[PDB]
Structure formats: structure tokens, C-alpha cells
Amino acid sequence: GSSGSSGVEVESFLVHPGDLLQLRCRLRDDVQSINWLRDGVQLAESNRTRITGEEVEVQDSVPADSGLYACVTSSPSGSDTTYFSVNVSDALPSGPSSG
């Protein structure tokens, strides 16, 4: 590994407990399949979470679902990978409600 800090693209994200966590996986023209991961583990869907293959959606996200998602596409020429740094927390720069 030669010197440098540029190896992969980690798409950063920010949400709160109750929002919709939507993600996207960069696919190719050769890609055949996709593998969703999270913190180094196979991702799963649920009443809230929804994996449409290359796009994930988690309704009413929470600070417990946050993490580093990684999508791996299986192609006859190799295998790409896309990371996504998510962060669910009530802490947001927007606060329309206050008194």
C-alpha cells in the first residue's frame, strides 16, 4: 500500500431517531448481484429496513441501526464495494420546535 489516504469512497450520512435512512449502491453495467453489509456483517431487512438490492430504506431510523454500510456487487470482472457512514441521532442542525 503506497503512501496516501485515498483508497475508497465512504459516503457520509446524518439522520435522527424517526427519520428515513435511505442509501444507494453504485452499480455497473457488468454487475450481476449485490451484497449489503453493516459493520462487517450481512445486512438484513425488517418492518423498517428495506433492501431493494442497491438501495436501502429504514423507516423511523434509530441511533442503534447506525454504522458503516458496505455494498458489494458481484461481477464477472471482479467485485466493487461502496461504504456508507451513517449516523442516527436526535442531534440535528435543524430545530423548528423550541420554547
Side-chain angles (χ1 to χ4, degrees):
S2 307
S3 183
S5 49
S6 58
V8 299
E9 59 202 290
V10 177
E11 208 160 69
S12 156
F13 279 83
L14 191 302
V15 298
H16 110 137
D19 270 14
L20 185 69
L21 178 64
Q22 274 178 349
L23 301 172
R24 209 167 299 89
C25 176
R26 274 179 74 274
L27 299 193
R28 331 164 71 69
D29 213 285
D30 295 57
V31 158
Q32 297 282 354
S33 210
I34 315 166
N35 209 31
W36 277 105
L37 293 149
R38 184 163 85 65
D39 210 317
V41 77
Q42 175 90 114
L43 187 70
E45 330 162 36
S46 201
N47 290 57
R48 296 175 289 166
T49 312
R50 171 90 150 160
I51 299 158
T52 49
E54 90 207 86
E55 272 170 322
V56 171
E57 170 182 317
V58 193
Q59 297 179 56
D60 208 297
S61 73
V62 269
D65 300 8
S66 320
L68 178 72
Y69 297 75
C71 83
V72 189
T73 74
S74 204
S75 58
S77 185
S79 37
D80 211 40
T81 312
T82 325
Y83 297 89
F84 316 89
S85 157
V86 166
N87 211 110
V88 184
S89 198
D90 42 71
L92 311 156
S94 194
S97 62
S98 208

PDB file of all heavy atoms in Angstrom, residues 7-11 24-28 31 34-37 68-75 78-84:
ATOM      1  N   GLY A   7      -8.229   5.734  -0.775  1.00  0.00           N
ATOM      2  CA  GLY A   7      -8.348   4.350  -1.200  1.00  0.00           C
ATOM      3  C   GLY A   7      -9.757   3.995  -1.628  1.00  0.00           C
ATOM      4  O   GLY A   7      -9.957   3.348  -2.657  1.00  0.00           O
ATOM      5  N   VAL A   8     -10.740   4.417  -0.838  1.00  0.00           N
ATOM      6  CA  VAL A   8     -12.137   4.139  -1.142  1.00  0.00           C
ATOM      7  C   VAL A   8     -13.017   5.347  -0.838  1.00  0.00           C
ATOM      8  O   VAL A   8     -12.570   6.311  -0.217  1.00  0.00           O
ATOM      9  CB  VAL A   8     -12.655   2.928  -0.343  1.00  0.00           C
ATOM     10  CG1 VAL A   8     -11.865   1.677  -0.696  1.00  0.00           C
ATOM     11  CG2 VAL A   8     -12.588   3.208   1.151  1.00  0.00           C
ATOM     12  N   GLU A   9     -14.269   5.287  -1.282  1.00  0.00           N
ATOM     13  CA  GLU A   9     -15.211   6.377  -1.057  1.00  0.00           C
ATOM     14  C   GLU A   9     -16.227   6.006   0.018  1.00  0.00           C
ATOM     15  O   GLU A   9     -17.046   5.107  -0.171  1.00  0.00           O
ATOM     16  CB  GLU A   9     -15.934   6.731  -2.358  1.00  0.00           C
ATOM     17  CG  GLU A   9     -16.715   5.573  -2.955  1.00  0.00           C
ATOM     18  CD  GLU A   9     -16.959   5.739  -4.442  1.00  0.00           C
ATOM     19  OE1 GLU A   9     -17.761   6.621  -4.816  1.00  0.00           O
ATOM     20  OE2 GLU A   9     -16.352   4.987  -5.232  1.00  0.00           O
ATOM     21  N   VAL A  10     -16.167   6.704   1.148  1.00  0.00           N
ATOM     22  CA  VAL A  10     -17.081   6.449   2.254  1.00  0.00           C
ATOM     23  C   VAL A  10     -18.150   7.533   2.345  1.00  0.00           C
ATOM     24  O   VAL A  10     -17.952   8.559   2.994  1.00  0.00           O
ATOM     25  CB  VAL A  10     -16.331   6.369   3.596  1.00  0.00           C
ATOM     26  CG1 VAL A  10     -17.309   6.170   4.744  1.00  0.00           C
ATOM     27  CG2 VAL A  10     -15.299   5.252   3.564  1.00  0.00           C
ATOM     28  N   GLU A  11     -19.282   7.297   1.690  1.00  0.00           N
ATOM     29  CA  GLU A  11     -20.382   8.255   1.697  1.00  0.00           C
ATOM     30  C   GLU A  11     -20.897   8.480   3.116  1.00  0.00           C
ATOM     31  O   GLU A  11     -21.416   7.563   3.752  1.00  0.00           O
ATOM     32  CB  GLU A  11     -21.521   7.764   0.801  1.00  0.00           C
ATOM     33  CG  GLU A  11     -22.361   8.886   0.215  1.00  0.00           C
ATOM     34  CD  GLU A  11     -23.147   8.450  -1.006  1.00  0.00           C
ATOM     35  OE1 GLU A  11     -24.093   7.649  -0.849  1.00  0.00           O
ATOM     36  OE2 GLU A  11     -22.816   8.909  -2.120  1.00  0.00           O
ATOM     37  N   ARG A  24     -27.754   4.243  -1.151  1.00  0.00           N
ATOM     38  CA  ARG A  24     -27.643   3.859  -2.553  1.00  0.00           C
ATOM     39  C   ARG A  24     -26.301   3.188  -2.829  1.00  0.00           C
ATOM     40  O   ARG A  24     -25.269   3.595  -2.294  1.00  0.00           O
ATOM     41  CB  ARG A  24     -27.808   5.084  -3.454  1.00  0.00           C
ATOM     42  CG  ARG A  24     -28.381   4.761  -4.824  1.00  0.00           C
ATOM     43  CD  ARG A  24     -28.822   6.020  -5.554  1.00  0.00           C
ATOM     44  NE  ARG A  24     -29.860   6.741  -4.824  1.00  0.00           N
ATOM     45  CZ  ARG A  24     -29.604   7.668  -3.906  1.00  0.00           C
ATOM     46  NH1 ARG A  24     -28.351   7.985  -3.611  1.00  0.00           N
ATOM     47  NH2 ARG A  24     -30.603   8.281  -3.284  1.00  0.00           N
ATOM     48  N   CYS A  25     -26.322   2.156  -3.668  1.00  0.00           N
ATOM     49  CA  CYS A  25     -25.108   1.428  -4.015  1.00  0.00           C
ATOM     50  C   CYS A  25     -24.748   1.639  -5.483  1.00  0.00           C
ATOM     51  O   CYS A  25     -25.557   1.383  -6.373  1.00  0.00           O
ATOM     52  CB  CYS A  25     -25.286  -0.065  -3.731  1.00  0.00           C
ATOM     53  SG  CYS A  25     -23.872  -1.092  -4.244  1.00  0.00           S
ATOM     54  N   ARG A  26     -23.528   2.108  -5.724  1.00  0.00           N
ATOM     55  CA  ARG A  26     -23.060   2.355  -7.083  1.00  0.00           C
ATOM     56  C   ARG A  26     -22.876   1.043  -7.841  1.00  0.00           C
ATOM     57  O   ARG A  26     -21.992   0.247  -7.522  1.00  0.00           O
ATOM     58  CB  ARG A  26     -21.741   3.131  -7.058  1.00  0.00           C
ATOM     59  CG  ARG A  26     -21.923   4.637  -6.963  1.00  0.00           C
ATOM     60  CD  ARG A  26     -20.584   5.356  -6.906  1.00  0.00           C
ATOM     61  NE  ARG A  26     -19.914   5.368  -8.204  1.00  0.00           N
ATOM     62  CZ  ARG A  26     -19.136   4.382  -8.638  1.00  0.00           C
ATOM     63  NH1 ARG A  26     -18.933   3.312  -7.882  1.00  0.00           N
ATOM     64  NH2 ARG A  26     -18.561   4.466  -9.831  1.00  0.00           N
ATOM     65  N   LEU A  27     -23.717   0.825  -8.846  1.00  0.00           N
ATOM     66  CA  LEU A  27     -23.649  -0.390  -9.650  1.00  0.00           C
ATOM     67  C   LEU A  27     -22.981  -0.117 -10.994  1.00  0.00           C
ATOM     68  O   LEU A  27     -22.722   1.034 -11.347  1.00  0.00           O
ATOM     69  CB  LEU A  27     -25.052  -0.959  -9.871  1.00  0.00           C
ATOM     70  CG  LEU A  27     -25.815  -1.373  -8.612  1.00  0.00           C
ATOM     71  CD1 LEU A  27     -27.031  -2.211  -8.975  1.00  0.00           C
ATOM     72  CD2 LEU A  27     -24.903  -2.136  -7.663  1.00  0.00           C
ATOM     73  N   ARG A  28     -22.708  -1.182 -11.741  1.00  0.00           N
ATOM     74  CA  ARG A  28     -22.071  -1.057 -13.047  1.00  0.00           C
ATOM     75  C   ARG A  28     -22.907  -1.739 -14.126  1.00  0.00           C
ATOM     76  O   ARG A  28     -24.001  -2.235 -13.857  1.00  0.00           O
ATOM     77  CB  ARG A  28     -20.668  -1.664 -13.013  1.00  0.00           C
ATOM     78  CG  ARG A  28     -20.010  -1.601 -11.644  1.00  0.00           C
ATOM     79  CD  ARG A  28     -18.809  -2.532 -11.560  1.00  0.00           C
ATOM     80  NE  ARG A  28     -17.686  -2.050 -12.359  1.00  0.00           N
ATOM     81  CZ  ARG A  28     -16.979  -0.968 -12.054  1.00  0.00           C
ATOM     82  NH1 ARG A  28     -17.276  -0.260 -10.974  1.00  0.00           N
ATOM     83  NH2 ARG A  28     -15.970  -0.593 -12.831  1.00  0.00           N
ATOM     84  N   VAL A  31     -22.165  -5.608 -13.340  1.00  0.00           N
ATOM     85  CA  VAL A  31     -22.691  -6.108 -12.075  1.00  0.00           C
ATOM     86  C   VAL A  31     -23.786  -7.142 -12.306  1.00  0.00           C
ATOM     87  O   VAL A  31     -24.571  -7.030 -13.247  1.00  0.00           O
ATOM     88  CB  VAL A  31     -23.255  -4.964 -11.210  1.00  0.00           C
ATOM     89  CG1 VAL A  31     -24.259  -5.502 -10.203  1.00  0.00           C
ATOM     90  CG2 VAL A  31     -22.127  -4.224 -10.508  1.00  0.00           C
ATOM     91  N   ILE A  34     -25.757  -7.984  -5.702  1.00  0.00           N
ATOM     92  CA  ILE A  34     -25.338  -7.011  -4.701  1.00  0.00           C
ATOM     93  C   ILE A  34     -25.384  -7.610  -3.299  1.00  0.00           C
ATOM     94  O   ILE A  34     -26.285  -8.380  -2.973  1.00  0.00           O
ATOM     95  CB  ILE A  34     -26.220  -5.749  -4.739  1.00  0.00           C
ATOM     96  CG1 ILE A  34     -26.426  -5.286  -6.183  1.00  0.00           C
ATOM     97  CG2 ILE A  34     -25.594  -4.641  -3.906  1.00  0.00           C
ATOM     98  CD1 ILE A  34     -27.532  -4.267  -6.339  1.00  0.00           C
ATOM     99  N   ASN A  35     -24.407  -7.246  -2.474  1.00  0.00           N
ATOM    100  CA  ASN A  35     -24.337  -7.746  -1.106  1.00  0.00           C
ATOM    101  C   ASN A  35     -24.272  -6.594  -0.110  1.00  0.00           C
ATOM    102  O   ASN A  35     -23.282  -5.864  -0.052  1.00  0.00           O
ATOM    103  CB  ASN A  35     -23.117  -8.654  -0.935  1.00  0.00           C
ATOM    104  CG  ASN A  35     -23.334  -9.720   0.121  1.00  0.00           C
ATOM    105  OD1 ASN A  35     -24.456 -10.183   0.332  1.00  0.00           O
ATOM    106  ND2 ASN A  35     -22.259 -10.115   0.792  1.00  0.00           N
ATOM    107  N   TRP A  36     -25.332  -6.437   0.675  1.00  0.00           N
ATOM    108  CA  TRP A  36     -25.395  -5.374   1.671  1.00  0.00           C
ATOM    109  C   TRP A  36     -24.769  -5.822   2.987  1.00  0.00           C
ATOM    110  O   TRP A  36     -25.071  -6.904   3.493  1.00  0.00           O
ATOM    111  CB  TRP A  36     -26.846  -4.948   1.901  1.00  0.00           C
ATOM    112  CG  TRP A  36     -27.346  -3.965   0.885  1.00  0.00           C
ATOM    113  CD1 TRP A  36     -28.200  -4.220  -0.149  1.00  0.00           C
ATOM    114  CD2 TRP A  36     -27.019  -2.574   0.806  1.00  0.00           C
ATOM    115  NE1 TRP A  36     -28.424  -3.069  -0.866  1.00  0.00           N
ATOM    116  CE2 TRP A  36     -27.711  -2.045  -0.300  1.00  0.00           C
ATOM    117  CE3 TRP A  36     -26.210  -1.722   1.563  1.00  0.00           C
ATOM    118  CZ2 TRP A  36     -27.618  -0.706  -0.667  1.00  0.00           C
ATOM    119  CZ3 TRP A  36     -26.118  -0.392   1.198  1.00  0.00           C
ATOM    120  CH2 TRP A  36     -26.819   0.106   0.092  1.00  0.00           C
ATOM    121  N   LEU A  37     -23.896  -4.986   3.537  1.00  0.00           N
ATOM    122  CA  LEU A  37     -23.228  -5.297   4.796  1.00  0.00           C
ATOM    123  C   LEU A  37     -23.315  -4.121   5.764  1.00  0.00           C
ATOM    124  O   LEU A  37     -23.639  -3.001   5.368  1.00  0.00           O
ATOM    125  CB  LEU A  37     -21.763  -5.657   4.542  1.00  0.00           C
ATOM    126  CG  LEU A  37     -21.513  -6.951   3.768  1.00  0.00           C
ATOM    127  CD1 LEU A  37     -20.235  -6.845   2.950  1.00  0.00           C
ATOM    128  CD2 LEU A  37     -21.445  -8.137   4.719  1.00  0.00           C
ATOM    129  N   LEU A  68     -21.456   1.492   9.596  1.00  0.00           N
ATOM    130  CA  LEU A  68     -20.781   1.617   8.309  1.00  0.00           C
ATOM    131  C   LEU A  68     -21.277   0.557   7.329  1.00  0.00           C
ATOM    132  O   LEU A  68     -20.830  -0.588   7.358  1.00  0.00           O
ATOM    133  CB  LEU A  68     -19.267   1.490   8.490  1.00  0.00           C
ATOM    134  CG  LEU A  68     -18.431   1.555   7.213  1.00  0.00           C
ATOM    135  CD1 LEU A  68     -18.406   2.973   6.662  1.00  0.00           C
ATOM    136  CD2 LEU A  68     -17.016   1.059   7.475  1.00  0.00           C
ATOM    137  N   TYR A  69     -22.203   0.950   6.461  1.00  0.00           N
ATOM    138  CA  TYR A  69     -22.761   0.035   5.472  1.00  0.00           C
ATOM    139  C   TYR A  69     -21.807  -0.142   4.295  1.00  0.00           C
ATOM    140  O   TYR A  69     -21.152   0.808   3.864  1.00  0.00           O
ATOM    141  CB  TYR A  69     -24.112   0.551   4.975  1.00  0.00           C
ATOM    142  CG  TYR A  69     -25.167   0.626   6.056  1.00  0.00           C
ATOM    143  CD1 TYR A  69     -25.136   1.630   7.016  1.00  0.00           C
ATOM    144  CD2 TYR A  69     -26.196  -0.307   6.117  1.00  0.00           C
ATOM    145  CE1 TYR A  69     -26.096   1.702   8.006  1.00  0.00           C
ATOM    146  CE2 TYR A  69     -27.162  -0.242   7.102  1.00  0.00           C
ATOM    147  CZ  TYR A  69     -27.108   0.764   8.045  1.00  0.00           C
ATOM    148  OH  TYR A  69     -28.067   0.833   9.028  1.00  0.00           O
ATOM    149  N   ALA A  70     -21.735  -1.364   3.779  1.00  0.00           N
ATOM    150  CA  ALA A  70     -20.863  -1.666   2.651  1.00  0.00           C
ATOM    151  C   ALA A  70     -21.566  -2.569   1.641  1.00  0.00           C
ATOM    152  O   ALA A  70     -21.927  -3.704   1.954  1.00  0.00           O
ATOM    153  CB  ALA A  70     -19.576  -2.316   3.136  1.00  0.00           C
ATOM    154  N   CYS A  71     -21.756  -2.058   0.430  1.00  0.00           N
ATOM    155  CA  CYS A  71     -22.416  -2.816  -0.626  1.00  0.00           C
ATOM    156  C   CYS A  71     -21.393  -3.418  -1.585  1.00  0.00           C
ATOM    157  O   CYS A  71     -20.552  -2.708  -2.138  1.00  0.00           O
ATOM    158  CB  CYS A  71     -23.389  -1.920  -1.395  1.00  0.00           C
ATOM    159  SG  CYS A  71     -22.603  -0.917  -2.697  1.00  0.00           S
ATOM    160  N   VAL A  72     -21.471  -4.730  -1.778  1.00  0.00           N
ATOM    161  CA  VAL A  72     -20.553  -5.427  -2.672  1.00  0.00           C
ATOM    162  C   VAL A  72     -21.298  -6.052  -3.846  1.00  0.00           C
ATOM    163  O   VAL A  72     -22.168  -6.905  -3.662  1.00  0.00           O
ATOM    164  CB  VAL A  72     -19.773  -6.528  -1.928  1.00  0.00           C
ATOM    165  CG1 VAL A  72     -18.663  -7.082  -2.808  1.00  0.00           C
ATOM    166  CG2 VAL A  72     -19.211  -5.990  -0.621  1.00  0.00           C
ATOM    167  N   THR A  73     -20.951  -5.625  -5.056  1.00  0.00           N
ATOM    168  CA  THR A  73     -21.586  -6.141  -6.262  1.00  0.00           C
ATOM    169  C   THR A  73     -20.721  -7.207  -6.925  1.00  0.00           C
ATOM    170  O   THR A  73     -19.537  -6.989  -7.177  1.00  0.00           O
ATOM    171  CB  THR A  73     -21.865  -5.016  -7.276  1.00  0.00           C
ATOM    172  OG1 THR A  73     -20.644  -4.609  -7.903  1.00  0.00           O
ATOM    173  CG2 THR A  73     -22.515  -3.821  -6.595  1.00  0.00           C
ATOM    174  N   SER A  74     -21.321  -8.358  -7.207  1.00  0.00           N
ATOM    175  CA  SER A  74     -20.605  -9.460  -7.839  1.00  0.00           C
ATOM    176  C   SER A  74     -20.657  -9.340  -9.359  1.00  0.00           C
ATOM    177  O   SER A  74     -21.731  -9.382  -9.960  1.00  0.00           O
ATOM    178  CB  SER A  74     -21.196 -10.801  -7.401  1.00  0.00           C
ATOM    179  OG  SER A  74     -20.247 -11.844  -7.531  1.00  0.00           O
ATOM    180  N   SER A  75     -19.489  -9.191  -9.976  1.00  0.00           N
ATOM    181  CA  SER A  75     -19.400  -9.062 -11.426  1.00  0.00           C
ATOM    182  C   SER A  75     -18.407 -10.065 -12.001  1.00  0.00           C
ATOM    183  O   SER A  75     -17.474 -10.509 -11.330  1.00  0.00           O
ATOM    184  CB  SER A  75     -18.986  -7.640 -11.807  1.00  0.00           C
ATOM    185  OG  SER A  75     -17.747  -7.293 -11.213  1.00  0.00           O
ATOM    186  N   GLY A  78     -14.919  -8.811 -11.577  1.00  0.00           N
ATOM    187  CA  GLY A  78     -14.397  -8.512 -10.255  1.00  0.00           C
ATOM    188  C   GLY A  78     -15.496  -8.302  -9.233  1.00  0.00           C
ATOM    189  O   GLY A  78     -16.538  -8.957  -9.286  1.00  0.00           O
ATOM    190  N   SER A  79     -15.264  -7.388  -8.296  1.00  0.00           N
ATOM    191  CA  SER A  79     -16.240  -7.098  -7.253  1.00  0.00           C
ATOM    192  C   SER A  79     -15.981  -5.727  -6.633  1.00  0.00           C
ATOM    193  O   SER A  79     -14.969  -5.516  -5.966  1.00  0.00           O
ATOM    194  CB  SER A  79     -16.196  -8.176  -6.169  1.00  0.00           C
ATOM    195  OG  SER A  79     -14.869  -8.622  -5.947  1.00  0.00           O
ATOM    196  N   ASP A  80     -16.905  -4.800  -6.860  1.00  0.00           N
ATOM    197  CA  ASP A  80     -16.778  -3.448  -6.323  1.00  0.00           C
ATOM    198  C   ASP A  80     -17.342  -3.371  -4.909  1.00  0.00           C
ATOM    199  O   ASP A  80     -18.020  -4.289  -4.447  1.00  0.00           O
ATOM    200  CB  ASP A  80     -17.500  -2.448  -7.228  1.00  0.00           C
ATOM    201  CG  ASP A  80     -16.842  -1.082  -7.221  1.00  0.00           C
ATOM    202  OD1 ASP A  80     -15.595  -1.024  -7.219  1.00  0.00           O
ATOM    203  OD2 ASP A  80     -17.575  -0.070  -7.216  1.00  0.00           O
ATOM    204  N   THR A  81     -17.056  -2.269  -4.222  1.00  0.00           N
ATOM    205  CA  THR A  81     -17.532  -2.072  -2.858  1.00  0.00           C
ATOM    206  C   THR A  81     -17.782  -0.596  -2.572  1.00  0.00           C
ATOM    207  O   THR A  81     -16.986   0.265  -2.946  1.00  0.00           O
ATOM    208  CB  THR A  81     -16.527  -2.620  -1.828  1.00  0.00           C
ATOM    209  OG1 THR A  81     -16.121  -3.943  -2.196  1.00  0.00           O
ATOM    210  CG2 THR A  81     -17.136  -2.640  -0.435  1.00  0.00           C
ATOM    211  N   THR A  82     -18.896  -0.309  -1.904  1.00  0.00           N
ATOM    212  CA  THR A  82     -19.252   1.064  -1.567  1.00  0.00           C
ATOM    213  C   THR A  82     -19.607   1.193  -0.090  1.00  0.00           C
ATOM    214  O   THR A  82     -20.543   0.555   0.391  1.00  0.00           O
ATOM    215  CB  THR A  82     -20.439   1.560  -2.414  1.00  0.00           C
ATOM    216  OG1 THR A  82     -20.369   1.001  -3.730  1.00  0.00           O
ATOM    217  CG2 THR A  82     -20.442   3.079  -2.503  1.00  0.00           C
ATOM    218  N   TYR A  83     -18.854   2.023   0.624  1.00  0.00           N
ATOM    219  CA  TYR A  83     -19.089   2.234   2.048  1.00  0.00           C
ATOM    220  C   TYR A  83     -20.025   3.417   2.276  1.00  0.00           C
ATOM    221  O   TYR A  83     -20.138   4.305   1.431  1.00  0.00           O
ATOM    222  CB  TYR A  83     -17.764   2.469   2.775  1.00  0.00           C
ATOM    223  CG  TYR A  83     -16.827   1.285   2.725  1.00  0.00           C
ATOM    224  CD1 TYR A  83     -15.926   1.131   1.679  1.00  0.00           C
ATOM    225  CD2 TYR A  83     -16.842   0.319   3.724  1.00  0.00           C
ATOM    226  CE1 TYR A  83     -15.067   0.049   1.629  1.00  0.00           C
ATOM    227  CE2 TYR A  83     -15.987  -0.765   3.682  1.00  0.00           C
ATOM    228  CZ  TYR A  83     -15.102  -0.896   2.633  1.00  0.00           C
ATOM    229  OH  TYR A  83     -14.248  -1.974   2.587  1.00  0.00           O
ATOM    230  N   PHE A  84     -20.694   3.421   3.424  1.00  0.00           N
ATOM    231  CA  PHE A  84     -21.621   4.494   3.765  1.00  0.00           C
ATOM    232  C   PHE A  84     -21.650   4.730   5.272  1.00  0.00           C
ATOM    233  O   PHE A  84     -22.174   3.912   6.029  1.00  0.00           O
ATOM    234  CB  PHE A  84     -23.027   4.160   3.262  1.00  0.00           C
ATOM    235  CG  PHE A  84     -23.050   3.613   1.864  1.00  0.00           C
ATOM    236  CD1 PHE A  84     -22.934   2.251   1.638  1.00  0.00           C
ATOM    237  CD2 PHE A  84     -23.188   4.460   0.776  1.00  0.00           C
ATOM    238  CE1 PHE A  84     -22.954   1.744   0.351  1.00  0.00           C
ATOM    239  CE2 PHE A  84     -23.209   3.960  -0.512  1.00  0.00           C
ATOM    240  CZ  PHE A  84     -23.092   2.600  -0.725  1.00  0.00           C
TER     241      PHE A  84
END
